[PDB]
Write a protein that binds this DNA or RNA. Structure first.
Ligand code: MG
Ligand code: MG
Ligand code: MG
Ligand code: MG
Ligand code: MG
Ligand code: MG
Ligand code: MG
Ligand code: MG
Ligand code: MG
Ligand code: MG
Ligand code: MG
Ligand code: MG
Ligand code: MG
Ligand code: MG
Ligand code: MG
Ligand code: MG
Ligand code: MG
Ligand code: MG
Ligand code: MG
Ligand code: MG
Ligand code: MG
Ligand code: MG
Ligand code: MG
Lengths: 204, 147, 95, 211, 124, 205
RNA sequence: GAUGUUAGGAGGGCAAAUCCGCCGAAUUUAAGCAUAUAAUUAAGCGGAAGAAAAGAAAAUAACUAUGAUUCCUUUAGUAACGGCGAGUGAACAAGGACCAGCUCAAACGGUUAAUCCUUCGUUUGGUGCAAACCUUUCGACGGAAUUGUCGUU
RNA sequence: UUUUAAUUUAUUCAUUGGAAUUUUUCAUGUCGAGUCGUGUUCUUUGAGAUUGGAGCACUAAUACGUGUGAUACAUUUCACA
RNA sequence: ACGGACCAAGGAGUCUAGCAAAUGUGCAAGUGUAUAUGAUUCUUUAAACAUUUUACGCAUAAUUAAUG
RNA sequence: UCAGAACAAGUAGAAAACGUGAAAGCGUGGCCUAUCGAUCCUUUAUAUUUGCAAAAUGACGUAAAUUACUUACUACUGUGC
């Protein structure tokens, strides 16, 4: 019931009390380092709803990602090709800011952990702040538990880097099942390859 | 097989059959369909009249199944019965064969062709053309709509 | 295209109820929670504005409110729903 | 392009050579698959490698008449059979939580099929000798001699294949029974004409019901 | 077979000879007592002929029977009724020509615009 | 198929015109005898061949099942006909009946020697001798691609059931075995030559 | 929250054909070229596995309805897109291969965390010549956990 | 040697726990929010008054919900989730 | 006018996709057994055989932007 | 002109409807020979011709019928595209 209540509260967001809290929290974050471990989820219910559990090897990490489009990497603003490809400055990344956040923490910071999920937390005009739920696949507390244990497998290394976390699923366009997603389903690239494939037949 | 290829027959001639003055260069007339409407307009006109331009209504989601309706003409209806059975039917003006045209894999009955006079036919089908129906009736048969 | 649940389907391939002969075979807690939330959080500025507009009272005002809602939430239906909710709230307040 | 030939539509403008699969392995692959299947069968001594599928009618106006094996039996059909879903799963039968029945006749047919399957099947006990009755749906465990006898007989795979069409398409009917007055085309066209209004009426009715 | 029957309709008992294959026709209900010499009979056609209480002769047999071809009638199938022939003659583009363009499929999107209707440049 | 990058693994490029050498691409750098030499191009030592062979060439040919059946039938007919068989090269001067039918006892023979004896009795002694003679070392490079010996094709024994026939004729040069059910046109008419000498069991027939 | 050569652990690099993300061209075709095309390709960077990925419906259908993905045959060079030019181009059904389902969250259980883990152990077994494994249940002393583990569906 | 089928032998006594149906009561619960969605920009798509994705701005509804049902929209059905 | 001092070896209309007409062949209002299964199929066997005790293609009907 | 393609400009008609003349007639522009323009797109006209893909919107219109998921029957049926 408590968790439901807090969910309800969080739905409001722009309603005074919630808003104030959000403001406070973002201010606090602005001060803290770009990646920093948190003691406890600041959104426990939300964490629970994703992958978080109160077990020894479960860690929550807070990460700050810069907002806005990504200037297309080139020496000076100039592009050296056809006009269709000449623009920069208004180029968007295929990944989500959330995805980026999870990637950065999962990678050089938390290579030992496994990214399970991530949730929103707060934002400003400069940064979006995410709390990321991670697990230690070597901690027995995780190794034993038949629920969760899956993440202990080697096929789950750096899920965040292969777009296999929720955010990855989203931008890969796997979230929307249907005719809307025909072109990308086993994988976009894979699908494309399949389509290209000319099948000859030994017999023909 | 290679041995009966013309190039093998031209092997000792200089230009390999592709002309001495006008040589054989890679993609002379352009690539693929090329100057269709420019330097190759005449060809298009003469062999492919209505090629250029788009006509009529778009149909964003087709689904050819919705519209699938294989046709058979009455002319071929009696053929759908085996010879002996057909003979029997001919003999017995008293009894009329029903034909499930759908069961035989057809969705519409059209009326191209004669039906044997007097011999009544019971035709089961999804669609009929007016004329086909008329033909059937003239011969004392009925169309029974199926689904 | 359209079919009826009651009555068997006419054994035709087209038209209404066309098709085969086959016979067919055929809270309080939440409210409380909502109330609690309301007590805690109050409203959001846009919502407040909408409420104010509604209170103003005329047809034109209502239209304006609806428009505002549409602008805010996006989609007409959603906006309409929001407006309705606001109206209900206003009524409750009045009572 | 030259002469009176069809306009060239060969989509080979991409690096197609990078993705050519020639199936030199077809027949051999098939053989391998067969071998695997055989192995599986051997492993599952006596039991059939194939699972029961219900006959179902194909969608769309064009395949409607045909019937083919669908994946899974639907809770209702299981109930009719007198079986629990879990139990069914444990045995030979596929269950489908998502499938629904709108055809009573179809449902009946499915249940008949299920019954037939049940009749066909004999259940080997879970622990040796110890003959005990099944759970919810599962029938009974027979004795050893009976089992042996069954084994000695050939295991049929007739149920796991779809029942072929009943046939008809030609049936005798009397001339006096025929109706000389039934303009079928007229009926069709009239129906087509009246569609929209009928639909509207239906909608209205629905609305009324909703109140 | 139907065509053959039609041909034979005037003179009976004489032997129709066809220097090609004879196929049967589901469109026919009755088959008369035909004596036909062909290069080839489709099985079904042959069966039909047999049923009719007729005779199927091969060319050698015909020769044996009628070395001068007495009381024989030569018949040919419809040659220019072939799908290839529909593309020949005056090319579609030349006015009043009834030749089928070589196209991919059929429908609006396929050779039905400019040069096929008064509304798109020209017609035919 | 030749490997995909054959002759083209080089970074060679043409020096252009003003060096007094042909304009084929040339291997860069120096020190090696390879440096400066013509690169790819079919005319160049170490170049790629003209149209390099590829796996996607059509190897197999689909033939109408009906056509195949017809062919098989024809082959069978040929085998029946003594003259045709003779033409095909089999030594059939000493055989009474060329549609050769033998008792079911053959299906049960267990020893190659016995089979040989039977053949001899039949009249095929000469044929057997010929077969024996005809194992010879192939002319050419075949010798180096697992095709060392060439052997002429002898009789074809057709059986209804294998109760020893397979094993008893296995090892006699040129003798082939086939089940009535699965007859092979390749065997009935080797090299597309009609009229192989066929020995049928009565059951098989 | 820092801090520790604290006790126990993990990540880094190499290797890529298939595989998954990102990032990302141009030659080229259009007989020019600027949209298009090449191509969601090459290169770049990051990450896995014996396969990967996908996967248990916010699915398709409009039927008498089908029933997770994947793959093949097909739809189909089709609907469609496209200086409607060059070109590009699916999906549903249908026939198969294979077929497997599920658990968290939320609801409920306070006559009580029924859970979990580290360390130290304790005593029946089974193999092996050893080395070793393989299992068996039982308690301590710690912690973790009420910001929620476990059971129930 | 590897394992994995079939066949063979299981029989007694102890009760802690659980499960499937099946009756009858009572409960109509719960169902993932800066998320969907809209506007706008760029990209991507066969997707066409935008197919997916992304950035930014705005920012929802509780299952009578809201999301599909390939032309934008309003009012209302219905089907499937 | 250009290329060729000489000799030996190598050295250039090919292969696939779809379409076309030509002709051969089988069948013929049909045809092609596609994948895939099956076998008393397993050096050759990656082929050959078999096709479940209304698959789809092209063709058999055309035409219209189109409901048709 | 020519590929005997197009456009364009003509020539001969035909089916309408008219004008002019007493009438035969003549009139489909200018006495004749020049005065002009594809696809796509846009635009505005035409129509008892259609669609927008599960449906509906003129209209519960006209009859009936009873309270309702009733039965017939109507060339004319939203905005926008
Ligand atoms: Mg010459
Ligand atoms: Mg030359
Ligand atoms: Mg010249
Ligand atoms: Mg080489
Ligand atoms: Mg030599
Ligand atoms: Mg690494
Ligand atoms: Mg980019
Ligand atoms: Mg160019
Ligand atoms: Mg060029
Ligand atoms: Mg790359
Ligand atoms: Mg690895
Ligand atoms: Mg996986
Ligand atoms: Mg496919
Ligand atoms: Mg096609
Ligand atoms: Mg493309
Ligand atoms: Mg939900
Ligand atoms: Mg693009
Ligand atoms: Mg649809
Ligand atoms: Mg020169
Ligand atoms: Mg010189
Ligand atoms: Mg020289
Ligand atoms: Mg040479
Ligand atoms: Mg031909």
């Amino acid at each position: 019931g408590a968790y439901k209540y807090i969910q309800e509260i969080w739905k409001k967001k722009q309603s005074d009390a919630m808003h104030f809290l959000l403001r406070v929290r973002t201010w606090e974050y602005r001060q803290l380092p770009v990646v920093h471990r948190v003691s406890k989820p600041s959104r426990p219910d939300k964490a629970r709803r994703l992958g978080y559990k109160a077990i020894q090897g479960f860690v929550i990490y807070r990460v700050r990602v810069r907002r806005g489009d990504r200037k297309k990497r080139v020496k000076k603003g100039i592009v050296h090709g056809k006009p269709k490809h000449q623009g920069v400055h208004k180029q968007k990344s295929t990944r989500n800011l959330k995805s980026v956040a999870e990637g950065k923490v999962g990678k050089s910071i938390c290579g030992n952990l496994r990214v399970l999920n991530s949730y929103w937390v707060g934002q400003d005009a400069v940064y979006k702040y995410y709390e990321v739920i991670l697990v230690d696949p070597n901690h027995n507390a995780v190794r034993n538990n038949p629920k969760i244990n899956w993440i202990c497998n080697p096929v789950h290394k750096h899920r965040e880097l292969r777009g296999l976390t929720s955010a990855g699923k989203k931008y890969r366009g796997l979230r929307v099942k249907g005719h809307l997603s025909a072109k990308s389903r086993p994988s976009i690239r894979a699908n494309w390859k399949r389509r290209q494939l000319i099948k000859l037949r030994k017999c023909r | 097989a290679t041995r009966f290829k013309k190039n093998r027959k031209k092997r000792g001639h200089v230009s390999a059959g592709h002309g001495r003055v006008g040589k054989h260069r890679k993609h002379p007339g352009g690539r693929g369909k090329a100057g269709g409407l420019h330097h190759m307009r005449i060809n298009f006109d003469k062999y492919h009249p209505g090629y250029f331009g788009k006509v009529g209504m778009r149909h964003l989601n087709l689904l050819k199944n919705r519209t699938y309706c294989p046709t058979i003409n009455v002319d071929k209806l009696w053929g759908l019965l085996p010879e002996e059975k057909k003979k029997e039917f001919s003999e017995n003006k008293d009894i009329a064969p029903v034909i499930d045209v759908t069961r035989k894999g057809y969705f519409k009955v059209l009326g191209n062709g004669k039906l044997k006079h007097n011999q009544p036919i019971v035709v089961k089908a999804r669609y009929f053309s007016s004329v086909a129906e008329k033909k059937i009736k003239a011969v004392g048969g009925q169309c029974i709509l199926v689904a | 295209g359209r079919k009826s649940t009651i009555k068997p389907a006419t054994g035709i391939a087209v038209g209404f109820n066309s098709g085969h002969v086959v016979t067919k075979r055929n809270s309080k807690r939440k409210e409380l929670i909502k109330d609690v939330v309301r007590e805690i959080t109050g409203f959001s500025p846009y919502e407040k504005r909408i409420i104010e507009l509604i209170k103003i009272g005329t047809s034109a005002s209502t239209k304006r409110s609806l428009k505002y809602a549409k602008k805010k939430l996006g989609t007409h239906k959603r906006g309409k729903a929001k407006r309705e909710e606001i109206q209900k709230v206003v009524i409750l307040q009045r009572r | 392009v030259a002469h009176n030939n069809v306009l060239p539509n060969v989509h080979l403008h991409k690096w197609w050579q990078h993705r050519v699969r020639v199936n030199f392995s077809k027949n051999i692959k098939k053989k391998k698959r067969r071998l695997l299947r055989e192995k599986r069968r051997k492993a599952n001594g006596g039991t059939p490698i194939e699972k029961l599928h219900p006959i179902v009618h194909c969608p769309t106006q064009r395949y409607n008449f045909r019937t083919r094996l669908g994946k899974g039996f639907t809770f209702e059909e299981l109930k009719g059979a007198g079986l629990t879903p879990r139990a069914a799963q444990t045995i030979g039968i596929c269950y489908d939580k998502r499938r629904k029945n709108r055809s009573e006749e179809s449902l009946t047919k499915n249940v008949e099929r299920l019954l037939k399957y049940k009749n066909s099947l004999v259940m080997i006990p879970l622990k040796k000798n110890k003959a005990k009755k099944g759970i919810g749906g599962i029938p009974a465990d027979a004795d050893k001699n009976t089992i042996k006898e069954f084994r000695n007989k050939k295991p049929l795979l007739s149920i796991f294949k779809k029942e072929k069409n009943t046939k008809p398409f030609y049936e005798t009917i009397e001339v006096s029974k025929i109706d000389k007055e039934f303009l079928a085309y007229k009926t069709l066209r009239r129906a087509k004409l009246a569609e929209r209004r009928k639909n509207c009426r239906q909608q209205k009715k629905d609305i009324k019901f909703k109140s | 077979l139907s065509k053959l029957q039609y041909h034979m309709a005037n003179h009976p008992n004489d032997i129709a000879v066809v220097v090609g294959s004879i196929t049967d026709d589901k469109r026919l209900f009755s088959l008369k007592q035909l004596k036909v010499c062909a290069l080839r009979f489709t099985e079904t056609a042959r069966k039909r002929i047999e049923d009719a209480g007729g005779e199927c002769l091969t060319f050698d047999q015909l020769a044996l029977k009628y070395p001068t071809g007495k009381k024989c009638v030569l018949l040919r199938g419809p040659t220019k009724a072939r799908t290839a022939e529909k593309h020949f003659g005056k090319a579609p583009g030349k006015p009043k020509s009834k030749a089928r363009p070589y196209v991919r499929s059929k429908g609006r999107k396929f050779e039905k615009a400019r040069g096929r209707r008064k509304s798109r440049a020209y017609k035919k | 198929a030749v490997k995909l990058g054959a002759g083209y693994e080089t970074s060679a490029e043409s020096w252009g015109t003003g060096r007094a050498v042909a304009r084929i691409p040339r291997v860069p750098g120096g020190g090696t005898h390879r440096a400066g030499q013509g690169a790819f191009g079919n005319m160049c030592r170490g170049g790629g061949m003209f149209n390099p062979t590829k796996i996607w060439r059509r190897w197999g040919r689909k033939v109408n099942l009906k056509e195949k059946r017809y062919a098989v039938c024809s082959s069978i007919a040929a085998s029946g006909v003594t003259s045709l068989v003779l033409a095909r090269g089999h030594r059939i001067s000493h055989l009474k009946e060329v549609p050769l039918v033998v008792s079911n006892d053959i299906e049960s023979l267990s020893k190659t020697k016995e089979a040989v004896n039977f053949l001899v009795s039949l009249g095929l002694k000469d044929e057997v001798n010929r077969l024996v003679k005809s194992k010879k070392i192939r002319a050419g490079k075949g010798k180096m691609r697992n095709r060392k010996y060439k052997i002429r094709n002898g009789p074809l024994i057709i059986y209804e059931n294998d109760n020893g026939v397979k094993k008893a004729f296995r090892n006699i040069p040129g003798v082939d075995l086939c089940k009535v059910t699965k007859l092979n046109l390749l065997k009935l008419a080797p090299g597309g030559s009609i009229g192989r000498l066929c020995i049928w069991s009565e059951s098989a027939f």
